[PDB]
Design an enzyme around this catalytic site. Structure first.
Site, PDB file in Angstrom:
ATOM      1  CG  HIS B  17      47.813  34.636  44.545  1.00  0.00           C
ATOM      2  ND1 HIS B  17      48.778  35.300  45.272  1.00  0.00           N
ATOM      3  CD2 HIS B  17      46.627  35.039  45.066  1.00  0.00           C
ATOM      4  CE1 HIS B  17      48.170  36.061  46.186  1.00  0.00           C
ATOM      5  NE2 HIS B  17      46.868  35.931  46.091  1.00  0.00           N
ATOM      6  CB  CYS B  36      46.630  34.534  51.956  1.00  0.00           C
ATOM      7  SG  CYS B  36      45.628  35.995  52.266  1.00  0.00           S
ATOM      8  CG  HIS B  42      42.778  33.348  47.505  1.00  0.00           C
ATOM      9  ND1 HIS B  42      43.920  32.807  48.059  1.00  0.00           N
ATOM     10  CD2 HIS B  42      42.994  34.687  47.441  1.00  0.00           C
ATOM     11  CE1 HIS B  42      44.778  33.799  48.300  1.00  0.00           C
ATOM     12  NE2 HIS B  42      44.255  34.952  47.940  1.00  0.00           N
ATOM     13  CG  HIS B  44      42.905  39.033  44.466  1.00  0.00           C
ATOM     14  ND1 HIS B  44      42.228  39.306  45.636  1.00  0.00           N
ATOM     15  CD2 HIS B  44      43.957  38.253  44.811  1.00  0.00           C
ATOM     16  CE1 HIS B  44      42.872  38.701  46.639  1.00  0.00           C
ATOM     17  NE2 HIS B  44      43.924  38.054  46.177  1.00  0.00           N
ATOM     18  CG  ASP B  82      43.319  39.147  31.643  1.00  0.00           C
ATOM     19  OD1 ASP B  82      42.730  39.113  32.756  1.00  0.00           O
ATOM     20  OD2 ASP B  82      42.707  39.323  30.574  1.00  0.00           O
ATOM     21  CG  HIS B  83      41.055  35.353  32.190  1.00  0.00           C
ATOM     22  ND1 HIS B  83      40.839  36.631  31.716  1.00  0.00           N
ATOM     23  CD2 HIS B  83      39.904  34.975  32.796  1.00  0.00           C
ATOM     24  CE1 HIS B  83      39.613  37.012  32.031  1.00  0.00           C
ATOM     25  NE2 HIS B  83      39.027  36.026  32.686  1.00  0.00           N
ATOM     26  CD  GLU B 127      46.051  40.711  47.384  1.00  0.00           C
ATOM     27  OE1 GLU B 127      45.829  41.147  48.544  1.00  0.00           O
ATOM     28  OE2 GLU B 127      46.805  39.720  47.135  1.00  0.00           O
TER      29      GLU B 127
HETATM   30 ZN    ZN Z   1      45.390  36.903  47.458  1.00  0.00          ZN
END
Ligand code: ZN
Ligand code: ZN
Lengths: 138, 138
Positions: B17, B36, B42, B44, B82-83, B127
């Site tokens: 995101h 961010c 980037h 998580h 997911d993914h 996160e």
């Molecule tokens: Zn982030």
């Protein structure tokens, strides 16, 4: 989201009872319940405050329409209990001592059977101005 | 009545995101979000703990069968997140900044559509191991 609030409505009914347990002897019942054990019974003008909680509707501005709350309470409180002898007229008290605590529990259960899931928040019963029980389903 | 408990299940999903508000100018965005705000995003390995509460069934001994909670979480969390790229692949984040707070809210709302009324108690999203958000519908 929408703001959440608690809506309460008060009602009153007249009923008689006698505090007595068959698990206790004639003397134990007298020691534990005293004057409330009078064999012919006694009575009260009970006051009940029923509280429901939920979101305030964006159009009508109501948590629940008081009209519906009145109907549920007529059905769960007034019809079974008003102008009745608790121990002899309501099946539930055949084997449950009719203390204020148990009247609150009885009322709580009756309402649960009728109200939307999660609607009911509190049942407060004034046996007299100085003796009060609050039950919240715990 | 019956004893009441909280039953939680942990699940993790990988997603990318970028923290960026349409409502802000490119430079305001940079000051607010810092790294961010990296233009190409980037990601998580999010960890989510969902807690439901209710009565322990007297025969099965379950508040809810974990099998069923797993299925609910698959539909509410795994399938849509997911993914995936939060901002580009999930409609919700088109006009909502993808902070951990908003991801917890999104998951709460998804579960609410599926779950029995009153079942949901809490949604916890890590996160990272050091950045956590808890949402309880307030
Ligand atoms: Zn982030
Ligand atoms: Zn009395």
């Amino acid at each position: 989201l929408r703001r959440r609030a608690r809506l309460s409505r008060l009602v009153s009914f007249s009923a008689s009872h006698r505090l007595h347990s068959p698990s206790l002897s004639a003397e134990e019942n007298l020691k534990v319940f005293g004057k409330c054990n009078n064999p012919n019974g006694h009575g009260h003008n009970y006051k009940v405050v029923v509280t429901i909680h939920g979101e305030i509707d964006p159009v009508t501005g109501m948590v629940m329409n008081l009209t519906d709350l009145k109907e549920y309470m007529e059905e769960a409180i007034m019809k079974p209990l008003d102008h009745k002898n608790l121990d002899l007229d309501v099946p539930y008290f055949a084997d449950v001592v009719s203390t204020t605590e148990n009247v609150a529990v009885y009322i709580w259960e009756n309402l649960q059977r009728l109200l939307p899931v999660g609607a009911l928040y509190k049942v407060k019963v004034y046996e007299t101005d100085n003796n009060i029980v609050v039950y919240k389903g715990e």
